[PDB]
Structure 1
Amino acid sequence: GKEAVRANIAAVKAVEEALKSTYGPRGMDKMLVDSLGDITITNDGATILDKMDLQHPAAKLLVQIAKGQDEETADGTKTAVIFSGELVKKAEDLLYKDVHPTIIISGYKKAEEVALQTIQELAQTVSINDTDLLRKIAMTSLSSKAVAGAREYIADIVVKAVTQVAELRGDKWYVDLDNIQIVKKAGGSINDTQLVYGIVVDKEVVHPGMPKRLENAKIALIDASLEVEKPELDAEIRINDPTQMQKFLDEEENLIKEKVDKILATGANVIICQKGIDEVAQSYLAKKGVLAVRRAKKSDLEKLARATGGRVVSNIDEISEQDLGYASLIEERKVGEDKMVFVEGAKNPKSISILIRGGLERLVDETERALRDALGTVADVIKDGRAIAGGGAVEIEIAKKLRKYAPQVGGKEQLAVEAYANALESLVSILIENAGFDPIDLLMKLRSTHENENNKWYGIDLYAGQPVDMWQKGVIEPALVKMNAIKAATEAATLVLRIDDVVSA
């Protein structure tokens, strides 16, 4: 009976106590000091659970379901855990009062039914042209991150990037993130942030004698070395003769003009590689009038291949007119204090790039995280097409609607249902609390202003501190994330109740 089941509940309740203080943007920050002295300040639900040395099986079963998803978004995760641990919490008081755990699982199951269908008969249809909407949903992702600069810049780009790549897949829109490169440089400002309609190779040209801008450049993506490897790389030479030395390294020098000539046999305007380009081979490309780039990321040859229509080639005796790329005009421009080659006017319109700049050496990294999550989120908004008002709105409803339902559902099973409703309202209470107001007072002030039907989207505006329409202040969010959180948590929750006993090894 009561015995081991408490210890389990208790473990769950502890894990809740590790995230409680960090929910929403008035959330506090947890310090994590790494063993080699290195410091990390965070409020990320995952890390705080992932880096935690748990020894309690309950807690490990609960966080595997809570923390992780087999989805691109990393969001709803603090909700998933908080909501898990409150549902378990509120359930404990029913067992104190002697209700069978079997009932409370069925009760939470009937509540889970309704709660879920209550999101569905209420989301609003959002599709591609609802661009004046996606700008807001995006700020709702970026606003709790560290970005100090204007969010409007970043919101505007994120929208165009998703809409650029969107393509009908079975007569409904789909987007793949892989057609978008994200390049970042510290210093400068966020006003220098932009979308390039091309690909950007962050290695400059071989000599400035090469054209500054080339018209209709037939690109050559060469994975193979355009430089010598050293015959002494494995072990020391066995040549004792400088006459033999000469004729060998000459024939090796004539081998790189061969490699060059075997690619210029196809008549490319531009030649880019991921390894060196010899000092005889740089002079040789310069006298032919080609634009060459030396030692670029294997990462970017790839990014230019499926953009310009080209293929990355690892063998000169294999490059053909079929393998070259097409781009209308390739040029080299200066980004901050580094020159970089840009290859605009490529054959794929889905393929684009983003230049993030501004802020410190770690803040620019977290601006790239924020823009990555915002970009994913907006594309998920297109992939699904439902978006609801945040700030507690759909939540309060799932409670009130459930509370009216409860009377009719059954005997003991009532108390259970009524419990699921109260636990959700506990979430909005924790939220109000960390925001800086009295919970019972603000919740009541909302459940009177949320009794009539026309106040459907009413929540509590965190800074104003009083019940208003969240939708009409931009606070809108993905209806499916905040729906699978209810499924993740209620699973985890009910699983804690499912363990009768433990006999271990």
Structure 2
Amino acid sequence: GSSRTYGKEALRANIAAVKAIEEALKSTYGPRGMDKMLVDSLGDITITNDGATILDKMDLQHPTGKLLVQIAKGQDEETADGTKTAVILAGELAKKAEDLLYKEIHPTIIVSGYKKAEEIALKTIQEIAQPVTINDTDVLRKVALTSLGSKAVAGAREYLADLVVKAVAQVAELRGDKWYVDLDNVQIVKKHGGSVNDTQLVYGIVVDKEVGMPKRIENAKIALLDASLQMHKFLEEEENILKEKVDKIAATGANVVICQEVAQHYLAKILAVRKSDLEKLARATGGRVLTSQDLGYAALVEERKVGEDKMVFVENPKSVSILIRGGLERVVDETERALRDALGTVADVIRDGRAVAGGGAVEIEIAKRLRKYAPQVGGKEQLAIEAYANAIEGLIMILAENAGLDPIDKLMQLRSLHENETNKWYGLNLFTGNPEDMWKLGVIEPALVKMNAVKAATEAVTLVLRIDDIVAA
């Protein structure tokens, strides 16, 4: 038994499927605008704005929908970013294409035009950006704040934004004549019962553990250990293995002993501390997880009180800890989704070296280049590029509607202001509800995120229009 889907109706089925998952996500384009909740047959409950977190658990009848979703999920695994933009832009590209099919243009022509215009967009993004460097700290703070916002505590966390910017500046280097970073150089530590005021940067490694042993050690080495630190003859051999640590490793100054009972008395009579931490310490200290070799080095080691409880510190400088003591485990959980995402957002700026506005105004400027390229092509392909420009202009029309404005009137006012070239960066403000300068408002995005969004959208819609027939076996 085998099942088949055919002809114009196969396009109407697959276009309907992508319009359906668009409709299921259209309202949630952020940052202000309503959110969605998902519940288990076990009776469990979740509330989220985040499309990537939604598409982790959506329900998917048509295979082409599942495949488009897979492409979006891959885009998020590369970036964590743009994930809602890609699906929405794909959805509107697909719908506006349906308006051509009544004029009976053969689908391969549309797939030509929708591919060709994407060259002009991709070129135009690389034209209009401005440069940025590690030194440009207030612009980096604007970038961090734009990634951090849509939770009111982002105003209080404005000093926490400066902490991660300086942590990046210490993590950052040059490679390929470009500023160079990755996230995994930054350590984070996390305890409850604190506040935003507890938060710190360390320029070193933090050991979030509580221990006769000394509070302070200086100019010393470090021992890293996997797991913990003839009957009578073999009994004493495992006593000797303690002093065999002293005999060479203490004689060279390894004043702290870090483990994943006789030593607890003996070393107190030297500090002992109870895999990722041992890797971070191996990166910072040069140590490795007996042998007389494998030793790490540091100038300072301490245990100190940090809010409600004690913590241990080791103080290579190219890795940096930041310290969080939040009020609750709820705050730690959301501090990943805020802070590690913000750090990654900044790193993608650092590795781009260039930046663009975000007020939808990048998109409107692309629309103005497109309507000047299309008359040069002039074939039937022209109706496809004019459609593409109108469909991407169809994005901010949605974004304004989530700010409750009447969209058409604000769209025409915006385009009228943009027509005179009055600004490079006029766009649509979601709080004042007005056409405003989006750059002085401080709303910034990396150009890479636009490129990967527009790319993933065009890839998805070609994989819809290019399919004639489905068979199942």
TM-score w.r.t. structure 2 length? 0.93
Match of 1:445, SS state, is helix
Whether the 8 Å CA contact 1:72–1:376 is kept in 2: the answer is no
Distance apart, 1:305 and its partner CA: 1.6
Quick check: 2:52–2:76 contact (8 Å CA) kept in 1?
A: no
Using the TM superposition, name which of 179-188 and 423-432 deviates more: 179-188
Say which of 231, 242, 263 aligns to 1:260: 242
TM-score normalised by L of structure 1: 0.88
Within the candidate set 128, 134, 147, 2:140 is matched to: 134
Question: 1:281 corresponds to which letter in structure 2?
Answer: A
CA distance in 2, matches of 1:16, 1:97: 24
| Cα distance change of structure 1 residues 286 and 74 upon mapping to structure 2, 3 Å threshold | same
Give the SS at the match of 2:431.
coil
**Alpha-carbon spacing, 1:284–1:225, altered in 2? closer, same or farther (3 Å):** same
Partner in structure 2 of residue 416 of structure 1: 384
Cα distance in 2 for partners of 1:163, 1:383 equals: 13
Task: Look up the match of 2:228.
Answer: 225
Q: Distance in 2 between matches of 1:70 and 1:439?
A: 29
| 1:343 corresponds to 2:314 | yes
Aligned position for 2:370? 402
Selected match of 1:332 from 299, 303, 306: 303
Pair 1:303-2:283 in alignment? no
Match of 1:369 among 322, 337, 340: 337
Q: 59-68 or 139-148, which moves further after superposition?
A: 139-148
Q: 1:363 to 1:132 in 2, by over 3 A?
A: same
**Displacement, 1:325?**
1.4
AA in 2 matched with 1:179: N
State the match for 1:19 in structure 2: 25
Q: Secondary structure at the match of 1:162?
A: helix
Contact 1:204 1:339 in 2 (8 A): yes
Alignment partner for residue 264 of structure 2, among 282, 295, 305?
Answer: 282
Give the whole-Å Cα distance in 2 for the aligned partners of 1:450 and 1:137. Answer: 24
Cα-to-partner distance string for 1:380-418 (whole Å, 9 max, x where unaligned): 111111110101011001112212322332232222111
- Superposed displacement of residue 454, structure 1: 4.2
Which of 265, 270, 273 aligns to 2:259? It is: 273
Q: What root-mean-square deviation, in Å, do the aligned CA atoms of Structure 1 and Structure 2 show?
A: 1.9
SS at match of 1:302: helix
> Aligned with 1:455: secondary structure?
coil
Distance in 2 (alpha carbons) for counterparts of 1:445 and 1:149:
31
C-alpha distance in 2 between matches for 1:159 and 1:254:
53
Displacement of 1:327: 1.0
Cα contact 2:245–2:292 (8 A) shared by 1 = yes
Identity %: 82
Is the Cα–Cα contact under 8 Å of residues 108 and 417 in structure 1 kept in the other structure? Answer: yes
In 2, Cα distance between equivalents of 1:123 and 1:354: 32
| 1:37 positional shift | 2.4
**How many pairs were matched up?**
463
State the AA in 1 paired with 2:215.
K
Aligned residues of 2:110 and 2:384 also touching (Cα < 8 A): yes
Tell me, in whole angstroms, the C-alpha distance in 2 between the residues paired with 1:337 and 1:251: 46
Task: Give the direction of change, closer, same or farther, for the CA distance of 1:368–1:61 in structure 2 (3 Å limit).
Answer: closer
Give how far 1:443 is off. Answer: 0.7
CA contact (8 A) 2:374 2:385 kept: yes
Query: Which residue of 2 is the match for residue 235 of structure 1?
Result: none
Measured after TM superposition, the shift of residue 363 of structure 1 is 2.6
* CA distance, structure 2, for counterparts of residue 388 and residue 149 of structure 1: 23
Aligned to 1:386: 354
Deviation at residue 468 of structure 1 after TM alignment? 1.2
1:264 Cα deviation from its structure 2 partner = 1.3
457 and 97 in structure 1: CA distance in 2 versus 1, 3 angstrom threshold: same
- Secondary structure of the residue aligned to 2:201 is strand
Say which one has the larger Rg.
Answer: 1
Distance 2:425 2:218 in 1: 55
- 1:171 lines up with 2:177 in the alignment: yes
Q: Which aligned segments of 4 or more residues in structure 1 are displaced greater than 4 angstroms?
A: 145-149, 250-253
Tell me what 2:88 maps to: 82
User: Shift of residue 191 of structure 1?
Assistant: 1.6
- Verify the 8 A CA contact 1:153 1:193 in the aligned structure 2: no
Describe the SS at the equivalent of 1:178: helix
Distance 1:456 1:148, change over 3 A: closer
SS of the aligned residue for 1:204 comes to coil
CA distance in 1, matches of 2:227, 2:451: 50
| Residue matched to 1:96 | 102
* Offset from partner CA, 1:44-69 (integer Å, 9 cap, x none): 11232231221212212221222322
Alpha-carbon shift at residue 171 of structure 1 (Å): 2.3
**Structure 2: runs of 5 or more not aligned:** 1-6
Residue 469 of structure 2 is aligned to residue 497 of structure 1: no
TM-superposition CA deviations, 1:458-496 (whole Å, max 9, x none):
111110111111111110100011111111101111221
* SS in structure 1 at match of 2:435: strand
Where does 1:192-271 land on structure 2 (aligned, <5 Å)?
192-205=198-211, 209-226=212-229, 248=231, 254-265=236-247, 266-267=249-250, 268-271=254-257
